[PDB]
Swiss-Prot record, chain A:
Species whose genome carries this gene: Klebsiella aerogenes (Enterobacter aerogenes)
Annotated catalysed reactions: urea + 2 H2O + H(+) = hydrogencarbonate + 2 NH4(+)
Protein name: Urease subunit beta
UniProt similarity note: Belongs to the urease beta subunit family.
pH dependence: Optimum pH is 7.75.
Location in or out of the cell: Cytoplasm
Subunit structure as annotated in this protein's UniProt entry: Heterotrimer of UreA (gamma), UreB (beta) and UreC (alpha) subunits. Three heterotrimers associate to form the active enzyme. The apoenzyme interacts with an accessory complex composed of UreD, UreF and UreG, which is required for the assembly of the nickel containing metallocenter of UreC. The UreE protein may also play a direct role as a metallochaperone in nickel transfer to the urease apoprotein.
UniProtKB/Swiss-Prot annotation, chains B, F:
Name the UniProt record assigns to this protein: Urease subunit gamma
Organism in which the protein naturally occurs: Klebsiella aerogenes
Annotated InterPro entries: Urease_gamma, Urease_gamma/gamma-beta_su, Urease_gamma_sf, Urease_subunit
Pathway per the UniProt entry: Nitrogen metabolism; urea degradation; CO(2) and NH(3) from urea (urease route): step 1/1
SUPFAM superfamilies the UniProt entry points to: Urease, gamma-subunit (SSF54111)
Curated annotation (Swiss-Prot), chains C, D, E:
Pfam families: Amidohydro_1 (PF01979), Urease_alpha (PF00449)
GO function term, MF aspect, one: nickel cation binding
Entry similarity comment: Belongs to the metallo-dependent hydrolases superfamily. Urease alpha subunit family.
Identification of the protein by name: Urease subunit alpha
Domain of life: Bacteria
Chain positions recorded as Ni(2+) 1 binding sites: H133, H135, K216, D345
Binding locations of Ni(2+) 2: K216, H245, H271
Domain called Urease: residue spans: 128-552
Coiled-coil portions: none
Cofactor annotation: Ni cation
CDD domains tied to this protein: Urease_alpha
Keyword Coiled coil: no
């Protein structure tokens, strides 16, 4: 017996189903580490990360909510993005869109 | 003594441990609060002795074993945290998985 | 992407199909539904979802909630579901999917700059308990009860006076006024009961007009047919509830006489089993009637090895009152739904901080002795959990006419919530929220770098302070007092609530506990039978939610 | 029927002719009268008398009391009698026979639905003590004092400031206003004393107009003839009392000079023996005068083996102040009635929770050393008990002009009462009632099934909470402040009372303590003589009301 | 006559030229001036100076102070001088020579009948500390802080909620209102910070209009350039301050980006070293800018042997945040004046009762490691003492626009003072005064004959009670809230103060801490360099103000 | 430990008993509070051990005799009551005429 123990049934959960995705190669050209969160507007991340910003418009990382991906200096890797839903209106971040799209 | 609120609060922890310390001596398997109180009071004394935070993080995992506590207890205590005045001021000691 | 079920549970708490053990009992609950969109769950912290432009939106305070409890596993009489809870203006705004409509789908609970966050993932959230059998012997009882998960206390008293030690009665206008004023200092919702033992209606109307939301008829003041009839007549016209502790001595008549005096009118019977008081030895038969709303006090719950032994000196003819036959049966009657409420009977044959704890101990002992309820579906105790939680939340609220304000997690109700870690469910809460503000919670070293270092023990929070308390608690008044301007006259500082619907509730209205058994008690043997079959159970030698959690 | 005297005492407490030992002292009291009708005594409980139609009647709240203390054995300056006490509207309604006029005879205290009950059978009931020598060094003193049986505290201070450590003075309008506001938070009646040491009348009138009910003249601020005269002139015109701590150093003159400066005007002399302050070594001679109302502080009461030893460091020339000759005599002077009041001198050479305790210890030591008082009638210490109880109740109330509100158990006075079990009389109260509500009492385990399980220790009750407290306590003001609207201006929440009759009280007015002895002190030997006979006594090695009752 | 210097110091405290060791540190202060006239010093007690006609005069309350702290040794940013302090109407009246103009010379502080006295001879008096990094996780923090010598607390929170555990934010109108009401119950001056992370200005204006005096931008809610710009725009128009905890993850940009977003506008940077949060690993470079007001949280102060070890689990990438190189440098930067404030970060990586204590520990460790400051004159550490005391008093007050009310011992400022015995300086205060009334102090046995017997521990005084508290504390509001009538609307009982001058303070305005070093951090090695020279220091194995004073 | 008000209150009882326990050891005759504290703390331990209410009601009368306490004390204590967590939950133990 273990107080308050879970009995999680085996298997997996498919995340963000039914939504547009795209893969992008990203490279950190800065001399300091950069870590991006699951729901951050990818097209507006730190300017030192080199990639196709145009393709990443209206997209965020296709990873479980609240987690992040880190890029050490000089690191290059391929990430998968999932498109924003809701009203598809971006406000904040680097202040590049500030409205729908 | 000009005791501050934190000093008086710690007298509560010290006392809870005297209770647990006696019961352990009788040969009883400690419950949840008793276990937390015993390991915690042990750490506060380690600091009074001048032991480093690093040493206490390790020693704290050898105060009680799984056979000295009630069932389920070890799982109820993923870690134990307590602060005390070390020679170099107040420091925090976290003991991870103290009971095994 | 994809994520395994185990890791998912570790990060956001359990989802549909997962089971969770309640504390160290044998009761398991299974998530019946999840109101989230996988991938869009909200989480707080560095790099998480609840950040500007992301999970947090641009709406003004009026268009978002003040508080959001994320990833909560709700256990209420209506369901055991996974969802975010939104609280706005001190009340339950919604149960659904929290987030930002700008970039997230299915958002029903908007999070903005004016939103505070309580991470509830891995935690069970319930309505605050409601104890309707309080003896106001001392004010310290409110803290004890609040810490246990009880947020509303109804009862009567003036302090450590002989009258109050024995009965839940606040006698007359002066004491009633005094106690209504003292109540603003206590961090729980409060309603008062006056002395109902009089054969002059005007003496009762005065008390109601002064502020009581009910009347307690107690044998110590004379539970005679005349006094009973008088109290019920006033209750009928003033929409207040009556609580009864009948004539144990059978001095004015037997149980059938009291029942006749009641005349089919609504009445809340206290400690219906009898140990706490009532017609010896068959007051328990009252639970068969449609107008009787039956409750138990907690010392007899559940039947254990030391129960009978401790009950004699606690009484201080005892043998006519303390019966093993009725005590053993009471547990079963609760499992069956014949007894609808649990209460304490604080310091007058009851333990104030053990209402919730003991209710779960009964459920556990009944699962072990009787197995699954006929109503169970699936391999879980979901229905038995809903039947028992209703006993100290929605049912007490309905019996006393306050269900419109408190009693459950439904929209528009006061946000009186309790957060529990599954390992301590029913024993020691993680957070107790009153009217939308945390009022008490476990707190470690005040001078520490984090709130977790020892010693951790319950301490009053901002919701229990001065005017913030007044804004987060309710003082219940009878409709009459409310109209007569009692609140303004006594200059009460807390929010006011009026009771209504006390004369129309009947046994059929008790959530999941509406059984009216054809129950009989043997005058000689004291055996309890339902439809001729003997009702009984065995006493426990060891119980869960006990020695593993307490220092003493 | 008939009933034996022993069983009767066990059931209703002692009656006429029965004797009861006071705690563990040698003092015995004997019931002088019983106001009941044998067979008609009221008792509460299951099957008892106080039930509807029986001992409880049908009258409305206006026609019955709010509280009744049943079968109480009253010990007051006017008598030691057995009776029921009725309390209505926070005040003493009557002392007589409680019950229902419908079926009972000789009922003078009607019990109805609006009546609460405190079972006082087997208990001694007294008025709450009144300490007129408080140094407001910290607010915690109010709880300590309340627990000991003291309900009214008069004195001065601003907290732990050098001025307050030494003198009972609240200096000026600002601090006075601040302390009047802080007083609503304390569960005792309070009156404040300002600094009377000034030779400019207007500087004194301001303080009175601000709220003080008296003025303290203290040598630390300069107890000069000029300052003394100035304070007494203002007192005479503003009807406030003056308390004096004279010039110990004899710097401005000897005792006869101070007495001359006083000029036959009314004055309360603090610690008249001298140890606590005053003309060395003969300030004690003041008790011979008709205008002097003499009181003692408690550390010198009674003369014991460790008294002299502890007094030097507590002082911190000492030999001129701490005199065995005057300390030994003081006990006798109290027994004779030359010293009329006892007080503490809280944390400035006095123990706040030991006023009552030490007064009884003196009475005991005097009975043992001197035997019965010439006034005794019967084989009991009734008169000596009345003489001593008057010292910390009615006399202090008369000296400071508040006897119209508090000070004794008489009709119309505020219901400040203390219930004592005979075994703990003067040591640890069973219940302390303020303005008709219990404010503090011993309370066992809050979560227990009854209020008696350990640990039992004093805890604040409803009468000490928020607005209920404000309604059950009094803040005394000078007539001037009252008229100037100070209460409304500072927005005081408590009930207000005005002092009056401070200039007309004289030694002859002190209940049972009005002796004006022809006392002389030898300048060289320090010996105290009355009519030439040496006054003295022996020091105790062991005292009652001490090691048998305290944990430390 | 004449008197030797040693005896003089024993009687009136030290004078010009005397040195006093601060607690058990190596820091020595030397009296720079004495405002007395030798022979005319005022002293209280039997036979002393402060007596009618002598040191006390005949003036009315309006012409004399309410309180006088005699013979105090003041240590403030402007000087270390010996003088009497006069307090009138809850504010600092004057610093000079107290007494009676009638017979004494050079009297600038008139003592009359309305004057209370605090003997400060042999004691050090300072302004009350000001902590601007409070996480309102629990109300108990106010007592802990008050006891340590901190009288003003600025920060945000709603209690033990995930949002508050991580950020100093009181989210939205409802919680802000609730917390403003709860604040009247706390014995410290309070100002609240709202959540500044939004890209919609109106959502920020609402919070300011509701009552916050500042906005906290925290990475957990999203410290993006857009959110930062939005908060600073509102701050500029509403005269409120912004506190920043930048993007540690460098997710939206590196440090230079955040700095660019700030655009030269005023901003208070929290825990500028980085351990507590901020652009890894170079957020420390912010202290080079003229618009940045830099502060440190206390767990990294000072660099000791166990510092690094304890920081990982307290965090709960850690290596990017917890850097030995920046932690070692921080101590030096404080010694040089590049870091201008110290704060706690209560229960979110900071110890509430250790702000003052740790600041002195840094000064000590720097004296030992680096020797005298270039600014020192004489053989004392006077200048280093002024530089460090300014860090938790005047500078925090200037940064948040409250320097017009509190922050130092200057005339017209609220009388928030702390009395210290030299042996316990910075560790345990002798008296903590709020608005002219003692609010907390060490207090011995309540029932004792004097206030000194054991056990002595800190207990709340009259200045911390009900309405007296309301009169001695301030609740700070934004100019907008003040005008909108928030105080009247929420019915706040405490005195109100408005913040102003938050947009005009710059690094040059920080008293004795205005250095803008040409600082650089090596991206790889993390080494901190100023003008190319490496900044670093060694970790302490033992510190003063630690094991010699605490029971645990 | 998440101590509730009742647990902290009981630390007061436990501590009062340590005081009495030491004094008894010195050979002193216990006074009223010391006696109540000693017998009470003994009962709480009986419950922690798992002894029944019935057994404790009897054993409690054998902790102190009339020769181990001050005069008058036995009469001042007609009974002693205390509650503790037994294996089957909280129960009340009343010890009648504990000192003889
Ligand atoms: Ni009952
Ligand atoms: Ni009851
Ligand atoms: Ni005196
Ligand atoms: Ni005095
Ligand atoms: Ni931070
Ligand atoms: Ni912080």
């Amino acid at each position: 017996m273990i107080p308050g123990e879970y009995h999680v049934k085996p298997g997996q959960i498919a995340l963000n189903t039914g939504r547009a995705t795209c893969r992008v190669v990203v490279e950190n050209h800065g001399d300091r580490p950069i870590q991006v969160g699951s729901h951050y507007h990818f097209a507006e991340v730190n300017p030192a990360l080199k990639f196709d910003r145009q393709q990443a418009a209206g997209y965020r990382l296709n990873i479980p909510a609240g987690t992040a991906v880190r890029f050490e200096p000089g690191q290059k890797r391929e990430v998968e993005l999932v498109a924003f839903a809701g009203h598809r209106a971006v406000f904040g971040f680097r202040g590049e869109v500030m409205g729908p799209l | 003594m000009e005791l501050t609120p934190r000093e008086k609060d710690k007298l509560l922890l010290f006392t809870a441990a005297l209770v647990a310390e006696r019961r352990l001596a009788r040969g009883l398997k400690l419950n949840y609060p008793e276990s937390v109180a015993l390991i915690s009071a042990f750490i506060m004394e380690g600091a009074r002795d001048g032991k480093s935070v690093a040493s206490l993080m390790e020693e704290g995992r050898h105060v009680l074993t799984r056979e000295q506590v009630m069932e389920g207890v070890p799982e109820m205590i993923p870690d134990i945290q307590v602060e005390a005045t070390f020679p170099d001021g107040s420091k925090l000691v976290t003991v991870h998985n103290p009971i095994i | 992407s994809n994520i395994s079920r185990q890791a998912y549970a570790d990060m956001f708490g359990p989802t549909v199909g997962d089971k969770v053990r309640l504390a160290d009992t044998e009761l398991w609950i299974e998530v019946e539904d999840d109101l989230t969109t996988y991938g869009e769950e909200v989480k707080f912290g560095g790099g998480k979802v609840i950040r500007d432009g992301m999970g947090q939106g641009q709406m003004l305070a009026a268009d978002c909630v003040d508080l959001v409890l994320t990833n909560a596993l709700i256990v209420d009489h209506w369901g055991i579901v996974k969802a975010d809870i939104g609280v706005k203006d001190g009340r339950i705004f919604a149960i659904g999917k929290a987030g930002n409509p700008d970039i997230q789908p299915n958002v029903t609970i908007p999070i903005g700059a004016a939103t505070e966050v309580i991470a509830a993932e891995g935690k069970i959230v319930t309505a605050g308990g409601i104890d309707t059998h309080i003896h106001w012997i001392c004010p310290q009882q409110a803290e004890e009860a609040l810490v246990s998960g009880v947020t509303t206390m109804v009862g009567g008293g003036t302090g450590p006076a002989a009258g109050t030690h024995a009965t839940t009665c606040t006698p007359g206008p002066w004491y009633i006024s005094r106690m209504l004023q003292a109540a603003d200092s206590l961090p729980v919702n409060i309603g008062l009961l006056g002395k109902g033992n009089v054969s002059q209606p005007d003496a009762l109307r005065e008390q109601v007009a002064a502020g009581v939301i009910g009347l307690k008829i107690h044998e110590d003041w004379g539970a005679t047919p005349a006094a009973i009839d008088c109290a019920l007549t006033v209750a009928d016209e003033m929409d207040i509830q009556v609580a009864l502790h009948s004539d144990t001595l059978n001095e004015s008549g037997f149980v059938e006489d009291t029942l006749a005096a009641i005349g089919g009118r609504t009445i809340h019977t206290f400690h219906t089993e009898g140990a706490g008081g009532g017609h010896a030895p068959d007051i328990i038969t009252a639970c068969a009637h449609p107008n009787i709303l039956p409750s138990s006090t907690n010392p007899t719950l559940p039947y254990t090895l030391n129960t009978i032994d401790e009950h004699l000196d606690m009484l201080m003819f005892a043998e006519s009152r303390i019966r093993r036959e009725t005590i053993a049966a009471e547990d079963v009657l609760h499992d069956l739904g014949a007894f609808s409420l649990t209460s304490s009977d604080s310091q007058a044959m009851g333990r104030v901080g053990e209402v919730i704890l003991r209710t779960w101990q009964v459920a556990h002992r009944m699962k072990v002795q009787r197995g699954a309820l006929a109503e169970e579906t699936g391999d879980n105790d979901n229905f038995r959990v809903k039947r028992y939680i209703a006993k100290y939340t929605i049912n007490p609220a309905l019996t006393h006419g306050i269900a419109h304000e408190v009693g459950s997690i439904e929209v528009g109700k006061l946000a009186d919530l309790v957060v529990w870690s599954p390992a301590f469910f029913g024993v020691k809460p993680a957070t107790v929220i009153k009217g939308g503000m945390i009022a008490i919670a476990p707190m470690g070293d005040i001078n520490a770098s984090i709130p977790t270092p020892q010693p951790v023990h319950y301490r009053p929070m901002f919701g229990a302070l001065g005017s913030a308390r007044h804004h987060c608690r309710l003082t219940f008044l009878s409709q009459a007092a409310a109209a007569n301007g009692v609140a303004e006259r006594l200059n009460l500082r807390s929010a006011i609530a009026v009771v209504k619907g006390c004369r129309t509730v009947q046994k059929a209205d008790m959530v999941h506990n509406s059984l009216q058994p054809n129950i009989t008690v043997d005058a000689q043997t004291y055996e309890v039978r339902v439809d001729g079959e003997l009702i009984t159970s065995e006493p426990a030698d060891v119980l869960p939610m006990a020695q593993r959690y307490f220092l003493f």
